[PDB]
Amino acid sequence: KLVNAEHLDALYQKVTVANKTELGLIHIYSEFPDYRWVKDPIEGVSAIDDVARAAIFYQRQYQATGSAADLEKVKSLVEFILYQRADNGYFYNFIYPDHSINKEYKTSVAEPNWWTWRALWALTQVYPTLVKTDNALAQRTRETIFATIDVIYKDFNFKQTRGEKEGVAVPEWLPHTAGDQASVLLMALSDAQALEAKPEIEKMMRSLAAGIMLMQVKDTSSPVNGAFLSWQNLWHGYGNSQAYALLVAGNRLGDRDMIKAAFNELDHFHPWLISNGLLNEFTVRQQGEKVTLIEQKKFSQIAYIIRPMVFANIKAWEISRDAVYLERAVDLSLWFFKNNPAQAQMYYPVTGIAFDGIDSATTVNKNSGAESTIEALLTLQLIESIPDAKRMLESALEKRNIKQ
Numbered sequence: 001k002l003v004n005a006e007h008l009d010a011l012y013q014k015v016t017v018a019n020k021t022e023l024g025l026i027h028i029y030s031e032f033p034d035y036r037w038v039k040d041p042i043e044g045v046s047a048i049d050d051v052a053r054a055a056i057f058y059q060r061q062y063q064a065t066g067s068a069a070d071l072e073k074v075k076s077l078v079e080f081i082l083y084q085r086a087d088n089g090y091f092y093n094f095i096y097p098d099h100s101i102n103k104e105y106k107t108s109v110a111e112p113n114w115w116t117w118r119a120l121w122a123l124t125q126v127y128p129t130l131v132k133t134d135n136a137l138a139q140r141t142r143e144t145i146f147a148t149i150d151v152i153y154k155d156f157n158f159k160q161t162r163g164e165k166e167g168v169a170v171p172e173w174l175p176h177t178a179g180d181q182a183s184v185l186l187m188a189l190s191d192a193q194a195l196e197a198k199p200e201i202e203k204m205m206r207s208l209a210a211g212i213m214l215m216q217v218k219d220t221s222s223p224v225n226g227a228f229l230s231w232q233n234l235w236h237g238y239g240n241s242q243a244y245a246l247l248v249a250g251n252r253l254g255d256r257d258m259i260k261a262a263f264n265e266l267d268h269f270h271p272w273l274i275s276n277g278l279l280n281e282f283t284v285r286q287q288g289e290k291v292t293l294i295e296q297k298k299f300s301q302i303a304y305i306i307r308p309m310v311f312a313n314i315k316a317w318e319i320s321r322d323a324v325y326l327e328r329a330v331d332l333s334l335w336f337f338k339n340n341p342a343q344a345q346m347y348y349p350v351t352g353i354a355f356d357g358i359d360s361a362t363t364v365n366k367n368s369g370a371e372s373t374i375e376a377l378l379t380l381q382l383i384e385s386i387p388d389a390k391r392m393l394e395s396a397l398e399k400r401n402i403k404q
């Protein structure tokens with residue numbers, strides 16, 4: 001009842017190219033008040049960054065409901081992902097309005113980047129669904145998963161050298177030295193390891209987790225004790241799925257250290273964030289063992305901050321059976337329902353609209369692009385799948401002045 005795919009469905013478009021190749025697109029932007037399709041004028045109409053996450057949403061919907069229409073969307077979004085595979089084994093990101101591929105723009109080249117990791121994660125997430133339903137598409141997907149992993153393995157830097165920024169160690173072997181990108185590649189590799197275990201996949205998993213863990217703040221005197229930094233000495237909330245990824249990988253490998261590191265973020269940094277109304281980003285300085293805040297930015301706040309935290313807390317509950325994590329997951333979900341600095345409703349169950357962000361205490365961006373819609377839907381979809389969390393969120397919503 002909370003989850004309403006009507007706006008995401010309106011961003012979806014099936015296009016035919018070449019010889020009966022049917023591609024599922026998700027239009028990237030959509031603007032208040034008419035909420036039609038809006039493009040990026042330079043980059044194109046739809047990106048793997050969004051299509052990949054949409055594929056996961058619709059696959060999870062199909063798993064919950066068995067709806068033939070959800071499955072059809074999974075298949076066509078997967079076709080777009082496969083359509084974007086480059087000869088070198090990486091992926092292009094954008095498609096243009098004329099349905100040619102954006103191969104050369106910096107946000108779209110087939111080089112290791114965010115959209116590679118998201119594409120791979122989407123393919124590993126939807127493969128078990130495809131193998132039960134569509135033999136030919138499943139075979140192509142499996143071939144692509146492990147061919148892409150081959151390429152990533154061939155290019156992988158296992159030499160664990162460290163830089164430094166404001167006293168903080170930098171793992172030079174992570175992609176773009178980015179803990180957030182590393183977490184999604186780690187999630188994808190963990191899924192693939194369950195499909196076909198390979199020593200080189202475990203080796204990459206452990207190397208990524210080592211880099212992610214080196215970037216964690218471990219200073220019990222620091223306000224942001226437990227935080228997984230995103231890049232150098234910087235944390236940003238968006239896409240920061242390190243804790244969730246370490247829980248997934250730690251479970252896959254039986255690695256207690258990974259699990260312990262993830263809980264350290266959940267048990268210290270998450271309650272701090274929640275108590276302070278969330279943040280967009282911050283930077284730190286490290287002097288010896290002491291980690292201190294340099295600067296922080298409360299805005300902008302976007303749906304993509306909430307989803308990684310809700311994913312991690314639900315997973316923590318599943319592992320530990322501690323209800324505090326469900327309570328926190330629900331309290332974080334309330335960001336969509338006016339628990340935020342603008343006291344603004346950010347997701348509308350009646351229409352499926354998800355606002356694009358909070359820019360200050362008094363300014364809300366009422367556009368509803370693909371990313372914010374998918375991230376709100378994935379968050380609420382997870383809550384509604386856990387009966388105790390669903391019951392808790394419904395109880396919180398009956399008491400407040402939201403539109404539903």
Ligand SMILES: OC[C@H]1O[C@@](CO)(O[C@H]2O[C@H](CO)[C@@H](O)[C@H](O)[C@H]2O)[C@@H](O)[C@@H]1O
Pocket residue numbers: 029030031038356357359365367368369
């Ligand atoms: O502008 C295109 C596209 O960008 C987004 C990203 O969230 O919004 C940006 O641009 C808006 C005006 O064009 C600004 O008001 C907003 O602050 C900025 O984030 C989408 O909302 C929009 O569709």
Ligand SMILES: [Cl-]
Pocket residue numbers: 118184239
């Ligand atoms: Cl992601």
